[PDB]
Amino acid sequence: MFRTAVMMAASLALTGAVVAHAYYLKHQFYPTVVYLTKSSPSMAVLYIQAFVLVFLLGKVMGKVFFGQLRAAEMEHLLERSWYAVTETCLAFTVFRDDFSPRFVALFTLLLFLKCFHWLAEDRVDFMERSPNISWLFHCRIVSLMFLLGILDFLFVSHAYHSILTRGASVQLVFGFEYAILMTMVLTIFIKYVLHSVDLQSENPWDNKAVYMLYTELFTGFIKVLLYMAFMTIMIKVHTFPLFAIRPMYLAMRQFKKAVTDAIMSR
């Protein structure tokens, strides 16, 4: 806890130093803020402060939504988040959208929601094998389920009305990624429905595994369909993605690990 406060103070000291340097130069409100926006190191330090703020908000949201990290999903977050920040960075830079301080914020919002879906993934994965779970866990995780699903529905609606009204831009890829995240909250619902009808009966159910495999096959098909439509759109319009082929290979492997295993079983 000491190092977190040390990092926050060491970021706020630089932010205050940059703000005071600008205010000593241009002694008013409006030229000071305009000078902050045009200057590169000033906006860089403001970016650093914004990232530390969203980091602390993420930490308090993880504290209020999960009681304690298992220290086995913290790594899974670290590699998958590196994956993700590099994919968002490359998608931001190929599209020639230019560095704007209101679309970087949207991209970190997308990354933040992706991290929370992955945390929900691993929490329900341990809920599969947890014999002692209180009602607080159930209520908080189903609150996470809703909130996430409603958020991706809202952003999908916003992005498809954007792609209808404005024209071809980055809002299309934003809406498609939020549609994939919508399929993700769909997967965990069905998984939580099956593992909740598992716990309420003091006997194992053989049909639960079949339903889980069928649902995984389902949504794997939906995911590869979305990725293929995503491809066949951006070869046609703008430029080759050069990104999003990462989780696609994992999406076809998700289809491979579900369809072929069910074919070998059934």
């Binding site: 409100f29 409006y30 030229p31 803020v33 305009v34 902050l36 926006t37 045009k38």
Partner: protein
């Protein structure tokens, strides 16, 4: 005596080196001791100007007096500049004009531009376009003649408050249309062909339409277009190079020779040299002027720079009445100069500070929903007002929400 002046002009025209220019003036400074009436007027304009001889304002005043008693046009002109600017000597506008008139009488061209500009913007005298027509002409005849010989030496226009062939033949064709070369003269249609030549940027065409709007040929003779067409011709003389002599003094760290080589051109009636000669006095870098006569003198040259159509000089005339720079604090007077830079020149900042006087009840009675309009109008006018309105509108709604809770 006279043999010493020949050596200086030979090395000045032959060598462009800074040391060689100063070495050439060594004989010229020695020839000034012999009272050669041509010798002092080239070192009087270095003793008080700088970037030549070392700057010493008091060392030039008393030798200007003997230039006045001799009857020199170049001494009558500059001695009026001392009393107009209050430079080393108590300020007096009363006989500042008296020296400029006799310099204008004596045949000097600088004392005609300043007397013409004073008659045009109504500074020190009554604004009379008839008198501003007479003095601005004499300069235009004496500058269009040399520009046809020298080729029209172009000089860049540098404003410190911002940082720190095809048409040549159209002039002769338009000249033949008005006069008549093989065809009947038609003043109704020769006006449009002549006026289109000035849009290319050449200033020979700027002269010829001024005479067109003077005598009433073609178009009826209006005062406003009579001298404004004349003025931009006069602002491109051989004294137009004096920005670079002043601007190089600013970049070389000699800030007290960029406030004397700019205050003459401010007196000559510019706007590049009236903001910059006030921006240097804005930050108190000048040392000849006292610490108590630094803001009222910078208010005078911010006021002239605004009436000639500058956006920043109208915002920065709002600031000096907003905080109380050089004047007792007036929120009502500062209010007007902020909106005059909003409706007229559409300056993006000038409606943001309109919001602050609307939001916080300064100058006028407070109204919360009126202030919302001008912050919103600021974001439409520029791309850079999107940020500092958003943190202003969020603060705006916090007061509106907190007041509603208390009710």
């Amino acid at each position: 005596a006279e043999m010493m002046y020949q050596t200086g002009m030979k090395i000045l025209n032959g060598s462009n080196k800074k040391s060689q220019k100063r070495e050439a003036y060594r004989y010229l400074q020695k020839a000034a001791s012999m009272n050669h009436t041509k010798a002092l007027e080239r070192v009087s304009y270095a003793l008080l100007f700088g970037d030549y001889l070392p700057q010493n304002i008091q060392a030039a005043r008393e030798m200007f007096e003997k230039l006045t008693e001799e009857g020199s046009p170049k001494g009558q002109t500059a001695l009026g500049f001392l009393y107009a600017s209050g430079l080393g000597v108590n300020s007096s506008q009363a006989k500042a004009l008296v020296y400029y008139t006799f310099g204008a009488l004596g045949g000097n061209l600088i004392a005609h531009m300043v007397l013409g500009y004073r008659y045009w913007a109504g500074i020190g005298v009554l604004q009379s376009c008839e008198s501003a027509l007479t003095h601005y002409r004499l300069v235009a005849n004496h500058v269009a003649s040399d520009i046809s010989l020298t080729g029209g030496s172009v000089v860049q226009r540098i404003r410190l408050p911002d940082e720190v062939g095809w048409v040549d033949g159209q002039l002769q064709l338009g000249s033949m249309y008005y006069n008549g070369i093989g065809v009947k003269r038609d003043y109704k249609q020769a006006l449009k062909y002549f006026n289109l030549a000035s849009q290319g940027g050449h200033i020979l065409a700027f002269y010829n339409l001024a005479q067109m709007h003077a005598s009433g040929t073609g178009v009826m003779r209006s005062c406003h277009t009579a001298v404004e067409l004349f003025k931009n011709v006069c602002e491109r003389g051989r004294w137009s190079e004096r920005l670079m002599t002043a601007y190089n003094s600013y970049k070389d760290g000699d800030y007290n020779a960029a406030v004397i080589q700019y205050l003459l051109l401010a007196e000559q009636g510019y706007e590049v040299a009236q903001s910059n000669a006030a921006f240097i006095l804005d930050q108190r870098e000048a040392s000849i002027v006292g610490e108590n006569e630094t803001y009222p003198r910078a208010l005078l040259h911010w006021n002239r720079a605004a009436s000639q159509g500058y956006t920043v000089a109208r915002i920065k005339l709002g600031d000096y009445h907003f905080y109380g720079f050089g004047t007792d604090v007036d929120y009502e007077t500062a209010f007007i100069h902020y909106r005059l830079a909003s409706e007229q020149q559409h300056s993006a900042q000038a409606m943001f500070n309109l919001g602050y006087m609307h939001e916080k009840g300064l100058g006028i009675k407070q109204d919360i929903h009126l202030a919302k309009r001008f912050y919103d109008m600021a974001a439409e006018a520029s791309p850079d007002a999107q940020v500092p309105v958003f943190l202003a509108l969020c603060k705006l709604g916090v007061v509106y929400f907190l007041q509603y809770i208390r009710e």
